[PDB]
Design a protein around this nucleic acid. Structure first.
Lengths: 215, 225
RNA sequence: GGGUUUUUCCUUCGAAACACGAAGGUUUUUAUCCCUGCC
RNA sequence: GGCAAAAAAAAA
């Protein structure tokens, strides 16, 4: 007889000043013994609402919760950039206790074009027989943006790893790391190392590069 | 002023055992319910145990009964979690939480530790080799330009990078570690500044991998001529 | 029907989900208790 | 009308 919490949705995205609503439905009765948390990436969670609807001492007024039988909503009257987080609902009606799968609220802001960078693999790393040229996209929006690697105009595939920060808490911009990993052979073998990115701050795709030796 | 500080996690091998502890400061653990809540990497939170006051009664998630066991020491104002028969499924960040005061917040959890990461793996630890990423120019450098440290090949998470020992925070971006086919982690930390102050200031990153027990500071420079 | 004597469920509170405590509540079961004498 | 009686245990 374990109670299960069903949060909706898994993710959502609204502009600043938009109104956003999360809901959790309970398998069975939990009274108003429901709490809601905010979790920003990596840090611990924070209490927003206790007792299904009461507002915890210190939280902004724009967060509220209500209960309709077994239907719990959590509503953020005005979205603000500080509010990109992941929200969880918790029932503490009986043991064991149950959370939701979690709702990840992203934020909508105007398109911001990445400033692109390329780095030659430091030769201390060529001291070790491996190559790590690496490409960078700083402070941009939206998240979806595509990097292509070229080597002597030869398009490359299946050898590069991308990593992207969480959305910024102030201006809600993203940042991405494309790292191409290769050997010491293939680095001093070819000459030019192109990195082209296609994004919506770009009329045409932008490419940055260098040559080997001439650094 | 209230604060919970968990510790004791790390890398442990399957079948192995750990003990976490939770050091309370700011309030006495005997008068609230203390719970442990774990969170898998990138997945959601999961209640694990709790002990309620005065009675000292405990309760456990179905996931961990038989294996896990929560105790409290009211003198050391510490709550503990002994973990036996550890399995790969148990790899997570572990939080201890205080249940707030009944009038002040019902059954809500009002203060949380910052969490201690437990890695269940057969692998053995390796510290990173860290390589600088230099701002590359073949002409004059009067703009804003970026630079950073590459942190390659280590296990397990986490590493902690700090530019100039915490002096540099504006425009710093430490990327999440991605896991290479090698089975080791590797990430990049970047910081932006106007190059107008490049030649006068120094750019060292403070990397630190306590699993491997490594602390390295590389010193980021420009390239050829 | 009205009770006596024991139980429980619930409610508010005690730093308090259970356990312990305080102050309260209005119901109902057992033909498995009493409804008897006196001006 | 005025008194006096009597009396075991369960459940929400």
């Amino acid at each position: 007889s374990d109670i299960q919490m069903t949060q909706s949705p898994s993710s959502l995205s609204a502009s600043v000043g938009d109104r956003v609503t999360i809901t959790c439905r309970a398998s069975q009765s939990v009274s108003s013994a429901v709490a809601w948390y905010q979790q920003k990436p990596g840090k611990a969670p924070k209490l927003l609402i206790y007792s299904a609807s009461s507002l915890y001492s210190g939280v902004p007024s724009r967060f509220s919760g209500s209960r309709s039988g077994t239907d719990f909503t959590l509503t953020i009257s005005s979205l603000q950039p500080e509010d990109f987080a992941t929200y969880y609902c918790q029932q503490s009606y009986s043991f064991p206790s149950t959370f939701g799968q979690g709702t990840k609220v992203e934020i909508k802001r105007t398109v911001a074009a990445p400033s692109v960078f390329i780095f030659p693999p430091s030769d201390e790393q060529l001291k070790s027989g491996t190559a790590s040229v690496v490409c960078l996209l700083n402070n941009f929006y939206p998240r979806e943006a595509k990097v292509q690697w070229k080597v002597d105009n030869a398009l490359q595939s299946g050898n590069s790893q991308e990593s992207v920060t969480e959305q910024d808490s102030k201006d809600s911009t993203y940042s991405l790391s494309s790292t191409l990993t290769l050997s010491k052979a293939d680095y001093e073998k070819h000459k030019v190392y192109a990195c082209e990115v296609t994004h919506q701050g770009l009329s045409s795709p932008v490419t940055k590069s260098f040559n080997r030796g001439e650094c | 002023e209230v604060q919970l500080v968990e510790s004791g996690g790390g890398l442990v091998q399957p079948g192995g055992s750990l003990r976490l502890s939770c050091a309370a400061s700011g309030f006495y653990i005997s008068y609230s319910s203390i719970h442990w809540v774990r969170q898998a990497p990138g997945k959601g939170l999961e209640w694990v145990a709790s002990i309620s006051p005065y009675s000292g009664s405990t309760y456990y998630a179905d996931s961990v009964k038989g294996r896990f066991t929560i105790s409290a020491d009211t003198s050391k104002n510490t709550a503990y979690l002994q973990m036996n028969s550890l399995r790969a499924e148990d790899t997570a960040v572990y939080y201890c939480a205080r249940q707030g005061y009944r009038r002040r917040s019902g059954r809500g959890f009002d203060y949380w530790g910052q969490g201690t990461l437990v890695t269940v793996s057969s692998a053995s630890t390796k510290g990173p080799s860290v390589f600088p990423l230099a701002p590359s120019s073949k002409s004059t450098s009067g703009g804003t330009a970026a630079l950073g440290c590459l942190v390659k090949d280590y296990f397990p998470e986490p590493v902690t990078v700090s530019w100039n020992s915490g002096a540099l925070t504006s425009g710093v971006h430490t990327f999440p570690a991605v896991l290479q086919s090698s089975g080791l982690y590797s990430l990049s930390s970047v910081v932006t500044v106007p190059s107008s102050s490049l030649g006068t200031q120094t750019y060292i990153c403070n990397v630190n991998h306590k699993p491997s027990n490594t602390k390295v500071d590389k010193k980021v420079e420009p390239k050829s001529c």
